[PDB]
Tab-separated table of C-alpha atoms and ligand atoms in Angstrom:
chain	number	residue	atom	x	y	z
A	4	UNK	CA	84.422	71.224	111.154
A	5	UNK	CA	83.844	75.028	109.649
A	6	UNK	CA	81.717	75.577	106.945
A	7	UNK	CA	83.070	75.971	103.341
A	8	UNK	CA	83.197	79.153	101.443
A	9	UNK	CA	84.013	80.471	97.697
A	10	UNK	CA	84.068	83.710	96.533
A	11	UNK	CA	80.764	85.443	95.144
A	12	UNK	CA	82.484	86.223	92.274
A	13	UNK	CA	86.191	85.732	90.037
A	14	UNK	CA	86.011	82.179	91.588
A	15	UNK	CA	87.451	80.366	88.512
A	16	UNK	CA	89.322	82.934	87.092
A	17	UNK	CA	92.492	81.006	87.801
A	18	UNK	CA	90.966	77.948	86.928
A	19	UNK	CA	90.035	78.808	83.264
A	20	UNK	CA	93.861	80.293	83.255
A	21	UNK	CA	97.146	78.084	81.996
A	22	UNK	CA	98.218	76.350	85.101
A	23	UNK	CA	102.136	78.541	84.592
A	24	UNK	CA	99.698	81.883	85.339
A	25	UNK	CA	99.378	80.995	89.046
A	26	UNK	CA	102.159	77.931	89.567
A	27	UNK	CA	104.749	80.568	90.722
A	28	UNK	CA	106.804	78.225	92.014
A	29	UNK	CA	107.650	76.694	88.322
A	30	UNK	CA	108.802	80.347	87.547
A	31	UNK	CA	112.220	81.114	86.200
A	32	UNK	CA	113.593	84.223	87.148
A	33	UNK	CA	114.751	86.599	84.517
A	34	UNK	CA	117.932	88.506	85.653
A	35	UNK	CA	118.711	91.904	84.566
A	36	UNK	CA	122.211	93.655	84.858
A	37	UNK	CA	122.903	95.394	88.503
A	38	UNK	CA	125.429	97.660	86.968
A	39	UNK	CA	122.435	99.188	84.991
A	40	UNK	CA	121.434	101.251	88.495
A	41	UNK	CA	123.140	103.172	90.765
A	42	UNK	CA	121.651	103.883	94.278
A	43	UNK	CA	121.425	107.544	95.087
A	44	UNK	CA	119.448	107.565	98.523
A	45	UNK	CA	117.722	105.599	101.529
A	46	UNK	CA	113.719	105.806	101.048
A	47	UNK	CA	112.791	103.854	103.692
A	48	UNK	CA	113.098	100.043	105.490
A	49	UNK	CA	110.283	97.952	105.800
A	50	UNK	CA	110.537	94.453	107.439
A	51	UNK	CA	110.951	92.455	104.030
A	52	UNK	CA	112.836	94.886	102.439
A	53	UNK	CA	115.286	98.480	101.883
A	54	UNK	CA	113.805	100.888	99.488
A	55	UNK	CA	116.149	103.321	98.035
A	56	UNK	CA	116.073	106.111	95.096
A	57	UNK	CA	117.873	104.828	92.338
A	58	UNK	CA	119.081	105.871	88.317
A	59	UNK	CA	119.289	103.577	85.701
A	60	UNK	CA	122.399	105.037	83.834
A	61	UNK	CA	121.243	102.998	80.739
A	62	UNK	CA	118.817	106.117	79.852
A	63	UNK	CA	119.042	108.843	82.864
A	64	UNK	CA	115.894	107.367	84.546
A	65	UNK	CA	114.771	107.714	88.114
A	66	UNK	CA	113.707	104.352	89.773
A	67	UNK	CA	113.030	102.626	93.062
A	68	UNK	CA	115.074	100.063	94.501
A	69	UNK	CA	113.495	97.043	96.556
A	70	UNK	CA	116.171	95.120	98.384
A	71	UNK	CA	115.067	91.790	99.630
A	72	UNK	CA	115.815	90.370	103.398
A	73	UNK	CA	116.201	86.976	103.066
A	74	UNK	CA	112.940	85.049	102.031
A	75	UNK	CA	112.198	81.751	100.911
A	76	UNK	CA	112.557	81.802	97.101
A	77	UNK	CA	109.126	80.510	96.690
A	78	UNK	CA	107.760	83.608	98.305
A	79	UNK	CA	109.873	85.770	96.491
A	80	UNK	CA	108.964	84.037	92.711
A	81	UNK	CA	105.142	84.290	93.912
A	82	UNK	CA	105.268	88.189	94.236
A	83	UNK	CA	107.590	88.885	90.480
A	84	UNK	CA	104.941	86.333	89.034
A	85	UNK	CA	102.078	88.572	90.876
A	86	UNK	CA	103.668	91.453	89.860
A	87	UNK	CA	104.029	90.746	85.934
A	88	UNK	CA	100.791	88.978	85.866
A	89	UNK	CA	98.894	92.945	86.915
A	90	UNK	CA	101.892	94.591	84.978
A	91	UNK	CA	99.513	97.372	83.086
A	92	UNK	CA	96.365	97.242	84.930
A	93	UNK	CA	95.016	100.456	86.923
A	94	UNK	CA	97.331	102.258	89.533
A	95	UNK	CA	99.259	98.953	89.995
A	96	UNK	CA	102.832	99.248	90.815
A	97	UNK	CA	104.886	98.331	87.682
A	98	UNK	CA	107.622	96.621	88.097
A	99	UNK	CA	110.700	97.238	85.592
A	100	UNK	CA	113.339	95.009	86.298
A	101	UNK	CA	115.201	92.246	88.910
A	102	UNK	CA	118.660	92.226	89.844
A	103	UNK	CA	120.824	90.293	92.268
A	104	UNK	CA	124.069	91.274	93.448
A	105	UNK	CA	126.846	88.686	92.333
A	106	UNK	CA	128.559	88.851	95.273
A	107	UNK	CA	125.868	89.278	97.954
A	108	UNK	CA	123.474	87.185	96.121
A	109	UNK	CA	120.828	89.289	97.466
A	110	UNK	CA	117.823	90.189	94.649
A	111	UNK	CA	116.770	93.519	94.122
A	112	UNK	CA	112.909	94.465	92.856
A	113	UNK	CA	113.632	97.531	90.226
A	114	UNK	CA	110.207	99.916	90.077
A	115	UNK	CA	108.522	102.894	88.477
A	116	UNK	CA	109.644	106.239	89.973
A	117	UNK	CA	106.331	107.774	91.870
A	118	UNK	CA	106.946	110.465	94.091
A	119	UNK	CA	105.010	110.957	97.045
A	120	UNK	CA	103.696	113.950	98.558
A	121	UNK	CA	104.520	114.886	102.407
A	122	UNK	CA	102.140	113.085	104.316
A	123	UNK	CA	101.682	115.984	106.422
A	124	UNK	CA	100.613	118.702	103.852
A	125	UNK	CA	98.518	115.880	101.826
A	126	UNK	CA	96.708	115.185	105.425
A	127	UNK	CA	96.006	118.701	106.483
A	128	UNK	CA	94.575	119.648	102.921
A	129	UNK	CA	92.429	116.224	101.851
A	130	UNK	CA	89.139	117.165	101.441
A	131	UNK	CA	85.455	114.971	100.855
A	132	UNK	CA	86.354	114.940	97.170
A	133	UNK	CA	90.143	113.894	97.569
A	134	UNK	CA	89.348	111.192	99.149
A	135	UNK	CA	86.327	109.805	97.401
A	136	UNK	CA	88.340	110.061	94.272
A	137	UNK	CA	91.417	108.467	96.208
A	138	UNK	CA	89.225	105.581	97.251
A	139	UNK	CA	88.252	105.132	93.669
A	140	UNK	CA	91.737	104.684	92.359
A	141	UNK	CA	92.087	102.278	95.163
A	142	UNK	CA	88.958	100.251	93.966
A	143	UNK	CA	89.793	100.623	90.418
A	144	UNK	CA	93.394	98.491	91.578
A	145	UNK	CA	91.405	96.254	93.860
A	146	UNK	CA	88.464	94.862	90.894
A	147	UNK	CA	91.771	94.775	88.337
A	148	UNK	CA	93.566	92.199	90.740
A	149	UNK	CA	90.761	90.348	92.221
A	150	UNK	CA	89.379	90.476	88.371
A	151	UNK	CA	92.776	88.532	87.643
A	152	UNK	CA	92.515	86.040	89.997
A	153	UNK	CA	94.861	87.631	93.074
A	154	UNK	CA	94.228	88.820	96.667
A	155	UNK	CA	96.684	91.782	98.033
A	156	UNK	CA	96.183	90.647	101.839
A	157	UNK	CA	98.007	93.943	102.805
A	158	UNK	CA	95.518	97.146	102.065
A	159	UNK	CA	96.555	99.435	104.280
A	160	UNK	CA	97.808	103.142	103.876
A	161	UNK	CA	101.699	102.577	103.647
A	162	UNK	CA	100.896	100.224	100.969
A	163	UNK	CA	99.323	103.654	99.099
A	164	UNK	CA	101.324	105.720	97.444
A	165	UNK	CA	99.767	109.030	96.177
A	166	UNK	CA	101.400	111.809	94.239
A	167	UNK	CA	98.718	114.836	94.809
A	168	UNK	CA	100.266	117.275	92.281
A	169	UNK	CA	99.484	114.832	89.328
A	170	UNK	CA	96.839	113.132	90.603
A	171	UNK	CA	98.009	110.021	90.867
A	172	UNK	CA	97.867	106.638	92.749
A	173	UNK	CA	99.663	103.426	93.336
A	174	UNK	CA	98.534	100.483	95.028
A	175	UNK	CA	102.269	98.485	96.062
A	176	UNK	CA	103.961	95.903	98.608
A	177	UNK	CA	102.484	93.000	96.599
A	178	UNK	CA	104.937	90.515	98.989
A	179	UNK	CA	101.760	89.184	100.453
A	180	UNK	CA	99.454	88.382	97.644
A	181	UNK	CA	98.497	85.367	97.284
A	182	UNK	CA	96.404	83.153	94.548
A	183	UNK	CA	92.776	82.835	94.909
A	184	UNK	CA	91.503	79.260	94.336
A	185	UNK	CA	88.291	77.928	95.619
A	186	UNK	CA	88.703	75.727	98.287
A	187	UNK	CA	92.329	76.606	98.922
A	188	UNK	CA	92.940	77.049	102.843
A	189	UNK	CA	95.285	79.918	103.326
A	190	UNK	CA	97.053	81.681	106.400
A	191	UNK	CA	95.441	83.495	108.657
A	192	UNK	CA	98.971	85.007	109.468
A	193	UNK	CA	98.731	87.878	107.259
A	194	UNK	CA	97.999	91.578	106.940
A	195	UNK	CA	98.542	94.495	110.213
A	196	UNK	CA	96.547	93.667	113.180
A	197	UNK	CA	94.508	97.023	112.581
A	198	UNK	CA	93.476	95.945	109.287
A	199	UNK	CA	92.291	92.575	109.423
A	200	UNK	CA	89.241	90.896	109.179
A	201	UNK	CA	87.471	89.087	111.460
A	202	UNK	CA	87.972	85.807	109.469
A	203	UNK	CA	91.485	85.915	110.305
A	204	UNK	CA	91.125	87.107	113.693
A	205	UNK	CA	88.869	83.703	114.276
A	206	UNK	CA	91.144	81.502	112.432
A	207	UNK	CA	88.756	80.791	109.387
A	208	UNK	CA	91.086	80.071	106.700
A	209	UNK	CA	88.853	79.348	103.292
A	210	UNK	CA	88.962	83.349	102.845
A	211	UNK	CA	88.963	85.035	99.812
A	212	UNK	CA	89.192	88.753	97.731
A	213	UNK	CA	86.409	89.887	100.382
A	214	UNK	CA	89.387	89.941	102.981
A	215	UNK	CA	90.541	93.130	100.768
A	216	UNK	CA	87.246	95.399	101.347
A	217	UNK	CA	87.306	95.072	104.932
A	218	UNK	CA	90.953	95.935	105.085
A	219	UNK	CA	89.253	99.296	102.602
A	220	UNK	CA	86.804	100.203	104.730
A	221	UNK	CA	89.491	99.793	107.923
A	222	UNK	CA	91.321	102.766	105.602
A	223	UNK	CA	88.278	104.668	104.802
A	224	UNK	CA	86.738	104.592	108.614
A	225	UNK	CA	89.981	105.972	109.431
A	226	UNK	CA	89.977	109.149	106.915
A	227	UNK	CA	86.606	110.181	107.299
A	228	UNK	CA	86.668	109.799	111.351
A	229	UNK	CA	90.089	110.850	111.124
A	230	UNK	CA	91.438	108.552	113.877
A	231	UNK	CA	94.310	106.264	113.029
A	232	UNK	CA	94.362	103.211	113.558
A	233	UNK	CA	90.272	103.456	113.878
A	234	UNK	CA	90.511	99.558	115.461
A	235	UNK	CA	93.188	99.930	117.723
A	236	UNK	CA	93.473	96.119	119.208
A	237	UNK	CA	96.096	95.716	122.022
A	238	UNK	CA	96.625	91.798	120.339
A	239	UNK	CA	94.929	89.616	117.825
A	240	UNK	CA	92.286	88.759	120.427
A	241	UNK	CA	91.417	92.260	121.371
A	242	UNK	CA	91.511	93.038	117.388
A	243	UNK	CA	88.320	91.353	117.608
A	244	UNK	CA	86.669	93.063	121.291
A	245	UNK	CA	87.591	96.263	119.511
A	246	UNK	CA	85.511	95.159	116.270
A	247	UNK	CA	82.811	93.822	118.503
A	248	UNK	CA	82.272	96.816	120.613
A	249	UNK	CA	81.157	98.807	117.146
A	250	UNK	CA	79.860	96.072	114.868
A	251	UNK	CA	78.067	94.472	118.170
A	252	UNK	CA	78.309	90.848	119.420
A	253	UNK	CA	75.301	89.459	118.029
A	254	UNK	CA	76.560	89.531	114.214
A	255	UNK	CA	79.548	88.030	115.272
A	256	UNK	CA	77.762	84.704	116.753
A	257	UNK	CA	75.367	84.975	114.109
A	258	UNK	CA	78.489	84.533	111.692
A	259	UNK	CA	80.476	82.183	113.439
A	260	UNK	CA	77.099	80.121	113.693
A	261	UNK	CA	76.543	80.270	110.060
A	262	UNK	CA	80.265	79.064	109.271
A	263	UNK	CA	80.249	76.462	112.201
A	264	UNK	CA	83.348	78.097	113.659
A	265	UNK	CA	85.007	77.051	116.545
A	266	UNK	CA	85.978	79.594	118.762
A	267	UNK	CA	89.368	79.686	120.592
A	268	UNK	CA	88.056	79.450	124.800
A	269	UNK	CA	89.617	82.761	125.528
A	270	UNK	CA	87.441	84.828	123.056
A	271	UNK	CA	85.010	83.279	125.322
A	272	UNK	CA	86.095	85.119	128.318
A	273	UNK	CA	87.178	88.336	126.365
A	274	UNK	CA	84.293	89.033	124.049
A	275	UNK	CA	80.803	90.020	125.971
A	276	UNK	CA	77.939	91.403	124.823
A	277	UNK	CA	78.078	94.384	122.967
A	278	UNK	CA	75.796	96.963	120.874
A	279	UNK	CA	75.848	97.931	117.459
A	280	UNK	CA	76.626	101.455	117.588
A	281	UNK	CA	76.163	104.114	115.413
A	282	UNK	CA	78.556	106.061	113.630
A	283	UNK	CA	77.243	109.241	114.602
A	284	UNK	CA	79.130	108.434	117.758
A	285	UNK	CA	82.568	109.294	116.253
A	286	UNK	CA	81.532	112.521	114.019
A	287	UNK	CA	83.269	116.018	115.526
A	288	UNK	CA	83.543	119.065	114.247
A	289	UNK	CA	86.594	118.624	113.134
A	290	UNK	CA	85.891	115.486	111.092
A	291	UNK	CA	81.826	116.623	110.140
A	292	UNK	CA	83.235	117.741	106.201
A	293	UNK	CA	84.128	114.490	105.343
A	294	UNK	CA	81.224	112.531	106.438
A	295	UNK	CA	77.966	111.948	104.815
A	296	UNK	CA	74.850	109.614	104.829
A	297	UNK	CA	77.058	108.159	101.043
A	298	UNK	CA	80.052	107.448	103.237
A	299	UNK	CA	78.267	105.991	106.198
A	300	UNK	CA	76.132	103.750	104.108
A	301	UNK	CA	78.940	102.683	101.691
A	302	UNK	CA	81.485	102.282	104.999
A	303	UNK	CA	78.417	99.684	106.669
A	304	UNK	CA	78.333	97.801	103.602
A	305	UNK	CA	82.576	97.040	103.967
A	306	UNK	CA	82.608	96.478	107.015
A	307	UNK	CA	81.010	93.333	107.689
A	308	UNK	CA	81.856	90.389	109.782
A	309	UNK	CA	80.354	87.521	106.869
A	310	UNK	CA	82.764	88.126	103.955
A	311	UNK	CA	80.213	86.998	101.932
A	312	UNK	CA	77.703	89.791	102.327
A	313	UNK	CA	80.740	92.902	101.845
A	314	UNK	CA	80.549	94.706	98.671
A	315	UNK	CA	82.648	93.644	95.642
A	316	UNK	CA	84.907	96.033	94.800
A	317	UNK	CA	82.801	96.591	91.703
A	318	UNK	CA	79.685	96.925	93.925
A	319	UNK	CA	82.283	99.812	96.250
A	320	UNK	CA	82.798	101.711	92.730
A	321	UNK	CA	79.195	102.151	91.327
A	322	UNK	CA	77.806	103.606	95.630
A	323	UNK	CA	76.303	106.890	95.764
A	324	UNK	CA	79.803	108.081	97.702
A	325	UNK	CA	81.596	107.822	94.187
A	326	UNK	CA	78.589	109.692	91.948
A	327	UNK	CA	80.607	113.307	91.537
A	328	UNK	CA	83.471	111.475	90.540
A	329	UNK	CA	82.263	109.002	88.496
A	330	UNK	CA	80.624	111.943	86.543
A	331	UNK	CA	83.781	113.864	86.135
A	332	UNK	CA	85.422	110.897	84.271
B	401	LIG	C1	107.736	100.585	94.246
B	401	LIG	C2	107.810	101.482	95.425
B	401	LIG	N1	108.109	102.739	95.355
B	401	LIG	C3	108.239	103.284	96.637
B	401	LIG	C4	108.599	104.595	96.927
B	401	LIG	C5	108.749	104.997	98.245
B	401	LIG	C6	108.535	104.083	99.278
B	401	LIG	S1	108.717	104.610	100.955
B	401	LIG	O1	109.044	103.463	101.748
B	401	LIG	O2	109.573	105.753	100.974
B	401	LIG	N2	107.246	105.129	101.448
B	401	LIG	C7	106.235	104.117	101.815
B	401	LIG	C8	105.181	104.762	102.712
B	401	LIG	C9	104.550	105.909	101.934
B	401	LIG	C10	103.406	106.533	102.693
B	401	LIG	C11	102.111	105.916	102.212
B	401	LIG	N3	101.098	106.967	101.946
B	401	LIG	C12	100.032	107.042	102.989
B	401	LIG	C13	98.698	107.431	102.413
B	401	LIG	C14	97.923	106.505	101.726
B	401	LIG	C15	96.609	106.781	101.374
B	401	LIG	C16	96.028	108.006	101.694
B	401	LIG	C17	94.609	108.239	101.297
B	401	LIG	C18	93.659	107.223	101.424
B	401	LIG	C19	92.341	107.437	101.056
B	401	LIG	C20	91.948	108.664	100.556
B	401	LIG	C21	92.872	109.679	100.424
B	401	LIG	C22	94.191	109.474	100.790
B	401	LIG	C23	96.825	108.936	102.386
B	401	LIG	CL1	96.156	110.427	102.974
B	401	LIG	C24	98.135	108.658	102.728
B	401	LIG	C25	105.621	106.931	101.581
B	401	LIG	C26	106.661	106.259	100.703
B	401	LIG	C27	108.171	102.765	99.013
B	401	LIG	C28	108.027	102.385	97.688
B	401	LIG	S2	107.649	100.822	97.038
């Protein structure tokens, strides 16, 4: 069978914690009062969930409104326990509240108001800076939950919300996070297609925080090339031919050697020998200002098949990319 694997680092974090910290499914629900927030408008819809503009007439105060589809309840205590447990830490999403309608029985996630900038305008205007000091926000959320013991599974841009005229970041959509404990075999069944590691891809299931950085360097390939999605797999086998055709072939058998994974007969067919290209190969002129020898280095160091040998987010934060902003702090 495959090869075991823990994380380089947090690996007992949960461990050393009371076992109530990660046992979601012994958690008791505190209700607040529905009648405390009125809905105003329709944000959005998202597969798990509605997301609508809310007040809380209690004090005046603009919110954000998470309606839940139907989920199993376990799924649904394991994000509010995810949620308190990073309540406070950097650019998390802070959760304020949990209702359920009486009569629908359906529970409602009450947030922080953040707006969000167009996407448009923010696009057009970014900037090498904006989005080196972006990606630091990002990694500053990233070490905080991974520091506490908790994967997102889900880094991707709709799961970043930025608010340009304050400067100001949020990483949300916690519904997938999961628990990190080593030896713990988890589904592969998670994250978009675009964004997910090769570990998934190949079924290896002993994953861990790691799984997070490649999703990050999916994101940053995609701003500084400015080509979204930058992997753009037709299905979860072709995920990994689009992977392959960039990171080369002989990695991947190198890793799947190394982990003694067994590899589904199609890939067999599908997969072929490929070069490790260059990134020079996707640099235009219209893409040239936000690319440098930092970003190139620090993207090769994400974006590695062994999950092992990816920078920790704490590695990510002190790479020559970040320098200028780390000085402005
Ligand atoms: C508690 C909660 N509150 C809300 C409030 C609204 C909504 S929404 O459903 O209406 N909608 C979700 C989708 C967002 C778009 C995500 N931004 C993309 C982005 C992300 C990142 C970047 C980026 C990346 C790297 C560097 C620089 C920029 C860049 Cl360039 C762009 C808009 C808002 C849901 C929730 S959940």
């Amino acid at each position: 069978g495959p090869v075991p694997s823990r994380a380089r680092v947090y690996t007992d974090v949960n461990t050393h914690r009371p076992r109530e910290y990660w046992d979601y499914e012994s958690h008791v629900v505190e209700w607040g009062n529905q009648d405390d927030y009125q809905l105003v408008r329709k944000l959005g819809r998202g597969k798990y969930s509605e997301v609508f503009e809310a007040i809380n007439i209690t004090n005046n105060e603009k919110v954000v409104v998470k309606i839940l589809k139907p989920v199993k309840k376990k799924k649904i205590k394991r994000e509010i326990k995810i949620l308190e447990n990073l309540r406070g830490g950097p650019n998390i999403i802070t959760l304020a509240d949990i209702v359920k309608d009486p009569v629908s029985r359906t529970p409602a996630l009450v947030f922080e108001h953040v707006n969000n900038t167009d996407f448009k305008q923010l696009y057009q205007t970014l900037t090498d800076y904006d989005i080196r000091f972006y990606m630091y926000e990002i990694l500053k959320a990233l070490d905080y939950c991974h520091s506490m013991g908790i994967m997102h599974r889900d880094v991707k841009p709709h799961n970043v919300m930025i608010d340009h005229e304050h400067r100001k970041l949020r990483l949300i959509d916690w519904g997938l996070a999961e628990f990190y404990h080593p030896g713990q075999e988890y589904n592969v069944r998670v994250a978009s297609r675009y964004f997910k590691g090769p570990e998934l891809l190949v079924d290896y299931q002993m994953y861990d925080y790691s799984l997070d950085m490649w999703s990050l360097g999916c994101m940053l390939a995609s701003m500084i090339f400015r080509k979204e999605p930058f992997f753009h797999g037709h299905d979860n086998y072709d995920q990994l031919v689009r992977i392959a055709k960039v990171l080369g072939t002989e990695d991947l058998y190198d890793y799947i050697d190394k982990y003694n994974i067994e590899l589904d007969p199609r890939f067999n067919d599908i997969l072929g020998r490929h070069s490790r290209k260059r990134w020079e190969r996707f640099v235009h002129s219209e893409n040239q200002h936000l690319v440098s020898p930092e970003a190139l280095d620090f993207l090769d160091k994400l974006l590695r098949y062994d999950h092992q040998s990816r920078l920790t987010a704490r590695e990510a934060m002190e790479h020559p990319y970040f320098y200028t902003v780390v000085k402005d702090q």
